[PDB]
C-alpha cells in the first residue's frame, strides 16, 4: 500500500517535470542558485531549500517513508517561493499554477 502510494507520487513528479507544465514549472526544476540569481540573502531567509530535482533524487533513493513525506517536500518547495518573494512576482504566480496541479493530483491518489 505504501509502495503503491509512492508509485502514484512518482507519477505526479513525472507530470510536474513534463512538457505540459513547463511554461510555469521551469523555475522549480533545479535548486535555487543564490549566487547566480544574485539573491545573496536566500539562505539567510530560507533554511530548507527544495526543488524538483531533489525530490527526484530522494524518490529514486527510496528516501520517502510514505506519500506524506513526498508531499511535505513538494509543499516546502512552494512555501519557500511564497516566503522569499513579494507576492506580485511572476515566479509566485508560476508556483501557484504548479501547486494547483500538485494539490489536485495528490488529492486524487487512490
From Swiss-Prot:
There is a cross-link at residue 108 (Glycyl lysine isopeptide (Lys-Gly) (interchain with G-Cter in SUMO2)). Residues 1-109 form the Bromo domain. Ubiquitous. It is found in: Nucleus; Chromosome. Chromatin reader that recognizes and binds acetylated histones, thereby controlling gene expression and remodeling chromatin structures. Recruits transcription factors and coactivators to target gene sites, and activates RNA polymerase II machinery for transcriptional elongation. In vitro, binds acetylated lysine residues on the N-terminus of histone H2A, H2B, H3 and H4. Belongs to the BET family. It is linked to A chromosomal aberration involving BRD3 is found in a rare, aggressive, and lethal carcinoma arising in midline organs of young people. Translocation t(15;9)(q14;q34) with NUTM1 which produces a BRD3-NUTM1 fusion protein. This is Bromodomain-containing protein 3. It comes from Homo sapiens (Human). The lineage of its organism: Eukaryota, Metazoa, Chordata, Craniata, Vertebrata. The chain holds residues 307 to 416 of 726 of the full protein.
Amino acid at each position: 500500500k505504501l509502495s503503491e502510494h509512492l508509485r502514484y507520487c512518482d507519477s505526479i513528479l513525472r507530470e510536474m517535470l513534463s512538457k505540459k507544465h513547463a511554461a510555469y514549472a521551469w523555475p522549480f526544476y533545479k535548486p535555487v542558485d543564490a549566487e547566480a540569481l544574485e539573491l545573496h540573502d536566500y539562505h539567510d531567509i530560507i533554511k530548507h531549500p527544495m526543488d524538483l530535482s531533489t525530490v527526484k533524487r530522494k524518490m529514486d533513493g527510496r528516501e520517502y517513508p510514505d506519500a506524506q513525506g513526498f508531499a511535505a517536500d513538494v509543499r516546502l518547495m512552494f512555501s519557500n517561493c511564497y516566503k522569499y518573494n513579494p507576492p506580485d512576482r511572476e515566479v509566485v504566480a508560476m508556483a501557484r499554477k504548479l501547486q494547483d496541479v500538485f494539490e489536485m493530483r495528490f488529492a486524487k491518489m487512490p
